[PDB]
């Protein structure tokens, strides 16, 4: 079912030699601890002492190998999950991100893998030892009194039914916990992100009341969770107590009227006590591992991603190194659409473009022109027609080079958290003279000279360190460091004042006389 498949995917993300070590070490350790104190009860009514000590040593070394097994398997599972999740989600096409909310895909890298890598090993070892100690004590209390079987076979079914009822309630209850907790963090985000407009509007009290209501609601939800947990735990513990009473009195009656030993009497009552103590821990740890493995299944489902098609039907040796020449572009019938269910936003378009250092596209909004820009990088489906860049079609190149050898400037400025060098030079292969050049030609060096670091000051949080103007300027700058003979701008003047606009335009057209804009 759900736990079977989830835990199976979890363990399959680890090796099989690890599951062997884990399972068999657990069986051996617990069964041998049981065997040693059983044989101790036999030691009640000498080389026996020597072999008792050697069994104790066996127990301790088995527990050691158990602990190392658990730690290392948690490590490996977490590493593999995170690495594969990253490398796969990063492979997704633009549709995945433009369609799935970024918060949803972010919550996985944020909490879910965190939940795994520092909560699953602990709960795992907890319920492992819990359930196996419980089952061992059960087997022994069954053995030391053969009568207890006809009381245990009922008890397992009572347990089963009521814990199933609790879990079928708890699934819905946890769904409600999540649907109450999401609005909290959503409100915190929508508060940090728009604090300026709020303090401007002065409607602080209203939003404080909104969060107070959200908090009260989530607390009530957690209270319901707690009440249900108390209900089930009280139930199961009274069960364990009745079991203790049964096993104890039975062993008593038996021994003092049909003797077996006193040691085994003790064993019976003690493992009864142990069941009573560890049954609820088994169940609670089972609930916790079910929650965490639900998170694991969530990540595994997110791992079911869309391909990228980065493999281009061409020969990387056939494309020359300095491939883009003066930059003729013949587009024709370039019918494009975002997804299959969408309309062909741009259709039946042809245009032959010789070089000439510039061309121009204009028109009202909604004309599907930023889409025409995207067509150069196969982001749009381009289901009919095609573009030809001075020798070859586009649908045969590997997307990597296809998007590395052609520049672009987007409308909304998107920057990175880091120093200027990193924003301009992802790779560390660019002489700083070229950096100062790409800044001066975009009218930035005059700003940088007044900046203490000097292509060194930090840009914070996607760009929250300057003006939208300055952000767009940095975007143009990092788009200029490329030696492309062609590139495209998508309304990269909306944030530019007319004076900087004209100056930038003249400078870029003088500096790029051979390049096609």
């Amino acid at each position: 079912e759900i736990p079977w498949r989830a835990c199976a995917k979890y363990l399959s993300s680890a090796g099989i030699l690890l599951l062997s070590l884990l399972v068999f070490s657990q069986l051996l350790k617990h069964m041998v601890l049981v065997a040693i104190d059983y044989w101790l009860a036999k030691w009640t009514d000498t080389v026996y002492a020597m072999v008792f000590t050697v069994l104790c040593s066996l127990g301790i070394v088995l527990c050691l190998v158990t602990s190392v097994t658990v730690e290392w398997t948690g490590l490996k599972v977490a590493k593999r999950l995170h690495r594969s999740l990253l490398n796969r989600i990063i492979l997704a096409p633009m549709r995945f991100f433009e369609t799935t909310p970024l918060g949803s895909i972010l919550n996985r890298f944020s909490s879910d893998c965190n939940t795994i890598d520092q909560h699953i090993p602990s709960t795992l070892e907890c319920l492992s030892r819990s359930t196996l100690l419980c089952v061992s004590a059960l087997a022994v209390i069954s053995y030391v009194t053969p009568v207890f079987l006809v009381a245990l076979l009922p008890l397992a079914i009572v347990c089963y039914f009521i814990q199933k009822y609790f879990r079928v309630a708890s699934r819905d209850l946890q769904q409600l916990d999540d649907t109450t907790q999401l609005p909290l963090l959503s409100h915190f985000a929508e508060t940090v992100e728009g604090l300026t407009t709020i303090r401007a509007f002065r409607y602080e009290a209203r939003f404080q009341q909104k969060l107070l209501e959200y908090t009260d609601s989530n607390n009530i939800a957690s209270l319901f969770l707690t009440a249900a947990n108390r209900w089930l735990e009280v139930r199961m513990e009274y069960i364990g107590a009745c079991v203790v009473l049964i096993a104890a009195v039975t062993s008593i009656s038996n021994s003092l009227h049909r003797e077996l030993s006193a040691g085994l009497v003790g064993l019976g009552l003690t493992y009864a006590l142990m069941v009573s103590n560890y049954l609820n821990w088994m169940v609670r740890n089972l609930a916790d591992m079910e929650l965490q493995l639900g998170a694991v299944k969530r990540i595994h489902g997110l791992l079911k991603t869309e391909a990228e098609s980065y493999e281009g039907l061409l020969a990387p040796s056939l494309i020359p190194k300095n491939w883009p020449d003066q930059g003729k572009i013949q587009i024709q019938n370039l019918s494009v659409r975002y997804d299959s269910s969408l309309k062909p936003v741009l259709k039946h378009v042809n245009a032959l473009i010789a070089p000439g250092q510039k061309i121009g596209i204009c028109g009202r909004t909604g004309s599907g022109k930023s889409s025409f820009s995207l067509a150069f990088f196969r982001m749009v489906d381009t289901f009919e027609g095609h573009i030809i860049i001075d020798g070859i079609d586009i649908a045969k190149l590997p997307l990597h080079t296809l998007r590395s050898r052609l520049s672009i400037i987007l409308q909304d400025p998107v920057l990175f958290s880091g120093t200027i060098r990193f924003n301009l030079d992802p790779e560390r292969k660019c002489s700083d003279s070229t950096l100062w050049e790409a800044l001066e030609i975009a009218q930035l060096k005059l700003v940088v000279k007044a900046l203490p670091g000097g292509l060194d000051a930090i840009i914070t949080e996607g760009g929250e360190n300057f003006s939208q103007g300055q952000r767009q300027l940095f975007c143009l700058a990092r788009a200029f460091v490329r030696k492309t003979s062609i590139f495209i701008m998508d309304e990269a003047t909306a944030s530019i004042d007319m004076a900087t606009e004209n100056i930038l335009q003249k400078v870029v057209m003088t500096a790029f006389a051979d390049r096609t804009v």
Binding site: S335, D339, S340, S341, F383, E384
Partner: protein, 328 residues
């Protein structure tokens, strides 16, 4: 998107609100005979065990009621000789119903009810044995995977043949056995709207395949190409490139029906092709080749296709432009 048929032939249909049901326990009989081997085996074993224990409780209880377990006086004669525990009565039940009957545990005339129980257990044993035999026979006489050795191509193409536009796909048999009376039904499924107003959600139209006779008989030895000539009568006569895509209301169901060579049962395989799996302007790479006195069939690159330049308009527009070119 609610595929009507899965690629393997599973019908993804929801049959809600079925009023009448519960005919008789022969339905669950068939449920039994059509089931997984380990669980069917388990059902048989528990059938025998439950029979044995039921009649064993019976024998034990009767012997107990005859006042035979306690006295051991000697002058009395038991319902059944030499049973002195439920274990004994259980071994007796096995010896009887399995018809082993060693002899140390024998029925004696002293108890008519014991003879009655003997009669009843013999009848029950015979009937239950016959049921088990019929089940296991009806179950192991089945292939039930002969529908899984009949494969289709993961994609379908449309190309030119004799100047006409034709829909094509590949089909092949994996077992070396022959299929008997192989028959093909291609059937387009879509939501059509009547020229008079009504709408039919999963309307189906039998698109005829192409063949020398026009029938439906094929002879599947080497994996061949099932193809339909797109005439003006074909529902796909108004189909075009750039119209087929995952979000297009269109499906093509292919149904292979044929008698298994050995058993006189008739297997069926289903597959489906919707508007994203139907490639355009491609032809299947021939996998058949001549070998040293044989025909090697490379089942690798089975559904492998190759692009071939083809017109990019409807068979309707094909015929229009062809008449426009041939009218002079």
């Amino acid at each position: 998107r609610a595929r009507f048929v899965s690629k393997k032939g599973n019908c993804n249909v929801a049959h809600k609100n079925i009023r009448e049901q519960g005919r008789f326990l022969q339905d669950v009989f068939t449920t039994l005979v059509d089931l997984k081997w380990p669980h069917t085996l388990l059902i048989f074993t528990m059938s025998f065990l439950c029979s044995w224990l039921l009649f064993a409780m019976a024998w034990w209880l009767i012997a107990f009621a005859h006042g035979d377990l306690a006295p051991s006086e000697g002058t009395a004669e038991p319902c059944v000789t030499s049973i002195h525990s439920f274990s004994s009565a259980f071994l007796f039940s096995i010896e009887v119903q399995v018809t082993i009957g060693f002899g140390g545990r024998m029925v004696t005339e002293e108890c008519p009810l014991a003879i009655l129980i003997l009669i009843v257990q013999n009848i029950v044993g015979l009937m239950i044995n016959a049921i088990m035999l019929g089940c296991i026979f009806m179950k192991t006489a089945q292939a039930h995977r002969r529908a899984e050795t009949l494969i289709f191509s993961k994609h379908a193409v449309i190309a030119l043949r004799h100047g006409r536009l034709c829909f094509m796909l590949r089909v092949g048999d994996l077992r070396k056995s022959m299929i008997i009376s192989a028959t093909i039904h291609m059937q387009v499924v879509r939501k059509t709207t009547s020229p008079e107003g009504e709408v039919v959600p999963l309307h189906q139209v039998d698109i005829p395949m192409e063949n020398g006779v026009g029938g439906n008989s094929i002879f599947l030895v080497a994996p061949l190409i099932i193809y339909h000539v797109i005439d003006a009568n074909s529902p796909l006569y108004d189909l075009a490139p750039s119209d087929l895509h995952h979000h297009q209301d269109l499906e093509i169901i292919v149904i292979l029906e044929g008698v298994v060579e050995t058993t006189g049962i008739t297997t069926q395989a289903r597959t489906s092709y919707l508007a994203d799996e139907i490639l355009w302007g491609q032809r299947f790479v021939p996998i058949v080749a001549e070998e040293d006195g044989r025909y090697s069939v490379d089942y690798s690159k089975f559904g492998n296709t190759i692009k071939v330049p083809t017109p990019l308009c409807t068979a309707r527009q094909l015929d229009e432009d062809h008449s426009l070119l041939e009218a002079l």
